Amino acid sequence: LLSREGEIAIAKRIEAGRDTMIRGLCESALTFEAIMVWREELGTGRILLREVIDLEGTYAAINGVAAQPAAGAGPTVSAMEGELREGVMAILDAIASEFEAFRKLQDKLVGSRLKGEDLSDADRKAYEGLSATIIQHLKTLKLNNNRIEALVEQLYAINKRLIGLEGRLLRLADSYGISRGEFLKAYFGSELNPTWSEQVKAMGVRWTKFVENDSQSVTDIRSEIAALATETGVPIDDYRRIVQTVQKGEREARQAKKEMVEANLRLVISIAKKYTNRGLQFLDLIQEGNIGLMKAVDKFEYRRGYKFSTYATWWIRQAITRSI
Amino acid sequence: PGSATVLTLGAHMCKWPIGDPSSEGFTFCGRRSSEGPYCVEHARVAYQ
Numbered sequence: 120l121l122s123r124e125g126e127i128a129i130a131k132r133i134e135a136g137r138d139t140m141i142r143g144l145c146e147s148a149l150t151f152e153a154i155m156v157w158r159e160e161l162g163t164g165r166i167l168l169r170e171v172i173d174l175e176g177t178y179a180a181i182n183g184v185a186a187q188p189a190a191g192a193g194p195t196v197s198a199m200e201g202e203l204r205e206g207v208m209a210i211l212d213a214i215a216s217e218f219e220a221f222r223k224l225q226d227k228l229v230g231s232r233l234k235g236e237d238l239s240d241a242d243r244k245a246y247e248g249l250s251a252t253i254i255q256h257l258k259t260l261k262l263n264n265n266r267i268e269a270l271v272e273q274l275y276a277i278n279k280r281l282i283g284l285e286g287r288l289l290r291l292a293d294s295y296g297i298s299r300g301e302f303l304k305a306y307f308g309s310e311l312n313p314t315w316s317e318q319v320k321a322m323g324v325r326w327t328k329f330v331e332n333d334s335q336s337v338t339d340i341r342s343e344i345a346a347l348a349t350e351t352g353v354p355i356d357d358y359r360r361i362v363q364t365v366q367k368g369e370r371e372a373r374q375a376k377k378e379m380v381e382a383n384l385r386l387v388i389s390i391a392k393k394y395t396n397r398g399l400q401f402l403d404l405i406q407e408g409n410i411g412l413m414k415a416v417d418k419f420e421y422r423r424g425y426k427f428s429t430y431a432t433w434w435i436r437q438a439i440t441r442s443i
Numbered sequence: 444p445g446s447a448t449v450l451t452l453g454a455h456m457c458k459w460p461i462g463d464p465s466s467e468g469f470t471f472c473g474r475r476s477s478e479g480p481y482c483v484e485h486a487r488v489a490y491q
């Protein structure tokens with residue numbers, strides 16, 4: 120069903136969605152703490168190269184060919200790792216340095232908001248630059264899909280805790296007769312403001328009663344919230360935006376991938392037919408084949424000109440065989 | 444050079460990518476989509 124141009128278009132949408140995800144993720148301190156831990160665990164053999172990066176994709180990128188399953192003369196997983204390790208460590212190293220630089224301005228920005236003011240125009244432009252170069256760099260690292268998904272999960276988890284704390288504040292305000300709209304307009308954007316409770320008092324008797332009579336709960340929740348802002352190295356409203364950014368990119372990538380899998384079902388089937396009596400049901404063969412297809416999609420590099428279906432066949436086949 | 448980025452890419456808008464995703468000037472077509480991710484023109488390019 121897909122032309123070569125359709126295959127490319129899908130690859131590009133996946134890559135763009137992924138980039139949007141990374142773009143959002145790189146604003147959070149946690150994503151780079153995670154990458155620092157992975158650097159650590161690699162350096163000490165706690166984890167293997169293959170769990171951090173897309174091993175076959177990276178190795179294929181050495182000669183600009185198609186990614187293929189690891190091993191009769193082809194390279195084993197250990198072989199690929201041996202070829203790639205030094206370069207991956209070098210990149211993680213360079214990135215560590217750029218993260219430190221970036222995190223200094225993160226702390227500057229969060230602290231600045233905590234005092235009420237904002238980053239100097241220079242410190243801010245520097246922030247922008249660092250962000251850009253870091254996103255590009257991380258792109259050259261070719262992270263494992265599971266690692267990116269782990270980052271996304273962590274980000275969203277934080278967001279769930281935030282939404283909980285805001286829910287509490289919301290009903291609290293409600294009991295003093297402050298509507299959702301009234302509250303959210305008074306609250307969005309000022310989550311780090313130290314003089315918030317004193318400033319909202321000026322909004323009248325309901326607000327005054329709210330933050331004086333129930334000052335305890337209020338200051339507690341706002342403390343917890345502020346702790347999220349600390350745990351992620353960004354102000355709360357920024358975190359809101361990051362989360363939406365990542366969700367958007369994620370949905371684009373997911374949809375593009377889905378389209379690609381659907382469009383290559385026929386291929387999957389035609390491979391499943393060759394493995395009918397080998398112990399598994401036809402539908403099982405299909406689903407496994409699809410796991411393999413999805414892997415081919417994850418590792419597909421359109422820029423290198425190789426035909427998608429014949430490449431995908433290796434991964435489909437590997438998934439089927441392994442299940443058997 | 445279309446009228447959308449990933450962020451601004453609304454629904455029923457054409458998801459046809461223009462340029463290199465690594466490029467700062469990367470865009471999507473973003474014209475009215477019809478039965479799928481793509482306008483008729485880009486659907487034609489994308490399929491068969």
Ligand SMILES: [Zn+2]
Binds near residue numbers: 457458474481484
């Ligand atoms: Zn179009």
